[PDB]
Design a protein around this nucleic acid. Structure first.
Length: 1095
DNA sequence: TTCAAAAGAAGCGGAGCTTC
């Protein structure tokens, strides 16, 4: 109550009166914010924050005094102090630009003079900054404390924002641009991942500014001002940065790409500092000075990151105690620099790292235009990765003499799907380059005898890094394969690394020696293996060799196998038993390992299996159209085009069709996760086109090396055996492209029909500019869709089983129906509140609701059970942050541009999201969380969602714990969890309360195609309750299967490599039984257990 | 309709329709 005179004492001269019922100009800053109970920011109360902080940053002594700490970060030395001095001089220029822009704004259209007359311009979308100005003679001026504090925030953001941005994928870019995901032009995604959208830039900037202001939002102030003022400030700071060239604004015209797309979309990119700029060694000095509890910082020694209370971007959802425990365990792990890898990276040098692991130096005219763009994006990813690692090493180097002795902690958070994600773009969990330089793994091994376990472990890690598939063969067979590699092809690289580990020197042909020796095995962890093997060779005491080399306990087809175990709800089938065996669940085979399975029982994993099913399904398709020669020819051309450019499609001379497990890897995965067939066809086409674009660079590179080469030899020389032999491949290519782009298959009445597009590919090929775009991509996609993907989809269903497919449909419908009601009720209750506000004279259209009001509405939906609980996890599928609820601008810059949509935390339609949320969450999500908190939880690992890096000392026990954690997560019942929540929803939902658009969306999920048209509320309600029943039955089934599976002897090795499977000790023995006998026995127990329930 | 985060710009006027 007396908070009023409290924030007034601090800002006594802001224009206007802090009373919403006052008649003149009202000051919405003092209305929106309060002094906090405990200090959040050290600039609160300061009359000149830029001056005060500049002085604080001017010496180590003055910094320590300002932050009230006895010692400052040692990275804050002389060179870095000088760079921050210069950056403080620059913040003064930003402050100066901001002041001139306010002056321009007050003058134009006499806004200042009208504001002075009583016009409420501080409530316009452009005028919310007038809430932090002060009267100055005949005009107004910024309150200096707020302006400068905001500039300090602007500077910190400028320093570290790019390194904290989300990665954008194809789907993201498709949503942003409004362009179909399957039709995105090459490198467009790259351009958008390189920039920030307006929303992206402004929201992160607004966050920082509001945090530096160090105040609390008033629960009863309108969001229009609580989000609005800091956003308006952010917008002006972005605008200033564009003037100063700290940020480059590029307005990307979508009509240059797709001619009827009228969206123009702004992209903002922060001008990078030099890699060797001292400030990179310590880029958080301002943050750590301004904030009492800084966010951005590195964690050295026993400085442990705090544990997040809520899910990542889901403040409505508290991390459960079990989850918090898991975050605590992972944050506690110490990581250490492996000096030799760092020294290797440095000695190779950024340029050679790029030549080796990226695209090297691009000759933009030996390159096809589209190929050149993926090449850029490849370099980008490696180079930022390199620079980021080296910035971190620069700060670690200051902490101590020996960088390998400095312990490093990483912050983590639980995501929406229950995964423990390391914060930051470039860390060990997320960046392969960094993963081999900063490691939690470490062991002291006795490698003096090649016959002991320590050496075997060592071999296992070398071989897995060297791309030998170690889960498919026993340790012994692995050992021999590794030896053949080390003694053969890898030897000259090994010799080179031996020398490197002696003199510190690399030859000038280092890239060629590495590249040649490694071939397709090339990777960052391979470089580690060559390093560790050569370090071993020259080691003085082999009996105590110290190494961070790891073995990853890696999930075998983890997602699909989890789904099959978690949500198959029928009787047991022998196909299921055989298939689930491919993912490490073995029945009646005590101690059986994945290595033994693959070597003696079944060499086909789930990917191979579906590929084989696709071959059958392709056969069936070719038969139903056996006489249709145009259709036969069209399938032949697709298969030919794939054969020409993809390694996984083999066409032999017999016409024989061999398909490798690889083509099915992504399509199997994303299919279980709700992906439609069209999106799959697109990705397939995208890999075909990518290889073609590449081959076009191969042409230019052979046309320059011998301008007499024939076209066919330039394009297919490296792929053919002769001159005329290459000629027929060129003939296949041109023919395939011709027929696949001029003719598409369409489904009519259940039958495929060929149709002309009239936009077939015609013309002499120009290898530099050559581009499949538009109506031709779509054509390829249509062919890919009906002749390959649809058979593949059938293959997948036959593989993972139709029961699973059925569960996931029901899960999808239920969570979708639920999210539709939530989203629609939320929007309506919002409109009801806004209709009240219109009677309030203090309220203006644009102010929107208060947080308290929004919280009330969010709470009024609890009886619809928006959350899903498991006991250890909480999922909020509908949860989102969107612009559709407020549907209005939040603020603009002082030039009437940079219009930021008012985004509100609110439920939105799930789509198919319920599927991967529950699968990933109760699958690998639950498993890793279990692995982190279980009794005897493995220490010193790096967990990467479905795989775990383990030090060579602990590979046996950690692996067994991992398979035990798998078993624990297989006791889960996600469909039950959805059931519990959906049934509560079903007894509180009023379907008549819904808008017609929401009522129609529900019809789509709950009804067959026919009943949609004109169905009553009671129709779609009766349908929505049918789904509940379906869920109830599935969940009852999963529950019993699980109990029954536990009564039987199981050996689980889903987290494979090491050969250490978990045994459940089921007492019922099913050894010496075929899958058919086993299925009969499990089903007997099933029907037994069913009658347990009834009676 | 795969998940892990959203997301057009800008004149005139003072919101929100409008044209690109």
């Amino acid at each position: 109550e007396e908070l009023k005179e409290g924030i007034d004492a601090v800002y006594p001269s802001l224009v206007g009166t802090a009373d919403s019922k006052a008649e003149g100009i009202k000051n919405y800053f003092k209305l929106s914010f309060t002094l906090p109970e405990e200090q959040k920011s050290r600039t609160v109360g300061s009359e000149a924050p830029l001056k005060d902080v500049a002085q604080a940053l001017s010496s180590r002594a003055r910094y320590e005094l300002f932050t009230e700490k006895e010692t400052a970060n040692p990275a804050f030395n002389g060179e870095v102090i000088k760079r921050y001095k210069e950056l403080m001089e620059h913040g003064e220029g930003i402050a100066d630009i901001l002041r001139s822009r306010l002056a321009k704004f007050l003058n134009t259209k006499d806004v200042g003079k009208r504001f002075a007359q009583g016009t409420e311009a501080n409530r316009w979308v452009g005028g919310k900054l007038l809430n932090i100005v002060e009267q100055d003679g005949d005009t107004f001026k910024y309150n200096e404390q707020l302006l400068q504090t905001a500039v300090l925030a602007g500077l910190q953001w400028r320093l570290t924002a790019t390194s904290n941005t989300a990665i954008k994928d194809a789907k993201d870019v498709a949503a942003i641009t409004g362009i179909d995901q399957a039709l995105l032009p090459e490198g467009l995604v790259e351009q958008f991942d390189t920039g920030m959208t307006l929303t992206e830039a402004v929201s992160s900037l607004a966050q920082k500014i509001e945090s530096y202001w160090g105040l609390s939002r008033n629960p009863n102030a309108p969001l229009g001002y609580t989000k609005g003022i800091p956003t308006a400030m952010a917008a002006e700071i972005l605008a200033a940065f564009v003037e100063s060239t700290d940020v480059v604004e590029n307005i990307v015209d979508m009509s240059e790409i797709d001619p009827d797309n009228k969206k123009t979309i702004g992209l903002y990119t922060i001008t990078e500092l030099d890699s060797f700029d001292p400030i990179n060694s310590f880029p958080t000095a301002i943050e750590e000075a301004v904030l009492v509890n800084p966010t951005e910082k590195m964690f050295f020694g026993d400085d442990i990151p705090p544990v997040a209370n809520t899910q990542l971007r889901n403040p409505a959802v508290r991390n459960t105690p079990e989850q918090k425990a898991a975050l605590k365990a992972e944050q506690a792990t110490e990581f250490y620099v492996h000096t030799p890898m760092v020294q290797f990276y440095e000695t190779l040098g950024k340029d050679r790292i790029l030549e080796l692991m990226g695209a090297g130096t691009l000759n933009k005219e030996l390159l096809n235009d589209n190929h050149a763009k993926s090449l850029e994006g490849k370099n980008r990813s490696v180079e930022d990765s390199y620079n980021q690692l080296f910035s971190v090493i620069e700060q670690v180097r200051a902490q101590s003499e020996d960088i390998s002795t400095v312990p490093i902690h990483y912050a983590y958070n639980m995501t929406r799907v229950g995964r423990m994600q390391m914060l930051g773009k470039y860390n060990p969990q997320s960046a392969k380059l960094v993963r081999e330089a900063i490691l939690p793994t470490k062991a002291t091994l006795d490698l003096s005898n090649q016959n002991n376990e320590d050496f075997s472990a060592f071999q296992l890690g070398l071989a897995q890094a060297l791309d030998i598939k170690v889960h498919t063969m026993t340790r012994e067979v692995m050992s021999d394969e590794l030896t053949k590699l080390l003694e053969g092809n890898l030897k000259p690289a090994i010799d080179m690394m031996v020398e490197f580990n002696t003199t510190g020197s690399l030859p000038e042909n280092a890239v060629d020696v590495l590249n040649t020796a490694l071939g397709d095995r090339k990777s960052f962890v391979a470089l580690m293996a060559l390093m560790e093997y050569s370090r071993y060779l020259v080691a003085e005491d082999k009996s105590a060799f110290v190494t961070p080399l790891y073995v990853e306990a890696d999930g075998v087809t983890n997602g699909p196998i989890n789904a099959m175990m978690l949500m198959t709800g029928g009787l047991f089938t022998p196909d299921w038993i055989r298939n689930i065996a491919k993912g490490g669940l073995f029945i009646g085979s005590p101690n059986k390992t994945m290595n033994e399975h693959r070597s003696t029982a079944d060499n086909n994993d789930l990917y191979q299996a579906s590929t084989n099913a696709l071959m059958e399904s392709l056969g069936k398709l070719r038969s139903n159209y056996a006489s249709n020669m145009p259709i036969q020819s069209q399938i032949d051309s697709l298969l030919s085009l794939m054969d020409l450019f993809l390694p996984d499609i083999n066409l032999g001379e017999n016409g024989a069709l061999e398909l490798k497990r690889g083509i099915a890897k992504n399509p199997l995965t994303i299919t279980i996760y709700g992906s439609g067939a069209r999106g799959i066809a697109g990705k397939l086409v995208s890999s075909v086109t990518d290889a073609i674009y590449e081959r076009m660079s191969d042409v230019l590179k052979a046309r320059a090396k011998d301008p007499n080469i024939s076209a066919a030899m330039a394009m297919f020389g490296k792929q053919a055996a002769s001159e005329a032999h290459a000629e027929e491949l060129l003939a296949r290519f041109l023919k395939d492209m011709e027929t696949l782009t001029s003719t598409v298959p369409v489904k009519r009445k259940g039958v495929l029909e060929l149709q002309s597009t009239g936009t077939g590919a015609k013309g002499k090929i120009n290898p530099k500019t050559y581009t499949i775009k538009g109506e031709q991509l779509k054509a390829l996609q249509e062919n890919m869709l009906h002749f390959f993907v649809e058979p593949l989809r059938n293959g997948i269903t036959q593989t993972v089983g139709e029961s699973l497919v059925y569960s996931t449909e029901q899960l999808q419908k239920a969570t979708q129906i639920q999210s539709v009601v939530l989203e629609d009720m939320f929007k309506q209750r919002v409109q009801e509140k806004l209709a009240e506000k219109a009677k309030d004279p203090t309220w203006k259209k644009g102010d929107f609701l208060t947080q308290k009001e929004l919280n009330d509405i969010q709470a009024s939906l609890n009886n619809l059970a928006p959350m899903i609980e498991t006991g250890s996890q909480t999922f909020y599928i509908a949860g989102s942050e969107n612009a559709e609820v407020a549907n209005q601008v939040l603020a603009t810059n002082l030039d009437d541009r940079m219009r930021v949509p008012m985004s509100i935390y609110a439920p939105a339609q799930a789509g198919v999201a319920g599927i991967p949320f529950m699968t990933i969450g109760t699958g690998d999500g639950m498993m890793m969380q279990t692995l982190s908190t279980m009794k005897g939880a493995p220490k010193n690992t790096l967990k990467i969602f479905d795989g775990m890096n383990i030090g060579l000392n602990d590979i046996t026990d950690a692996s067994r714990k991992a398979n035990e954690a798998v078993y624990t997560s297989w006791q889960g019942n996600p469909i039950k969890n959805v059931y519990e929540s959906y049934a509560k929803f079903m007894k509180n939902v009023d379907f008549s309360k819904l808008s017609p658009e929401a009522l129609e969306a529900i019809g789509k999920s709950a009804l067959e195609y026919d009943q949609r048209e004109n169905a009553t509320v009671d129709d779609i309600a009766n349908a929505a309750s049918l789904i509940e029943r379906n869920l109830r039955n599935i969940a009852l089934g999963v529950d019993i299967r699980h109990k029954v599976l536990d009564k039987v002897n199981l050996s689980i090795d889903q987290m494979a490599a090491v050969g250490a499977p978990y045994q459940n000790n089921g007492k019922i023995d099913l050894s010496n039984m075929t899958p058919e006998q086993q299925a009969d026995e499990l089903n007997k127990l099933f029907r037994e257990e069913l009658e347990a329930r009834k009676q």
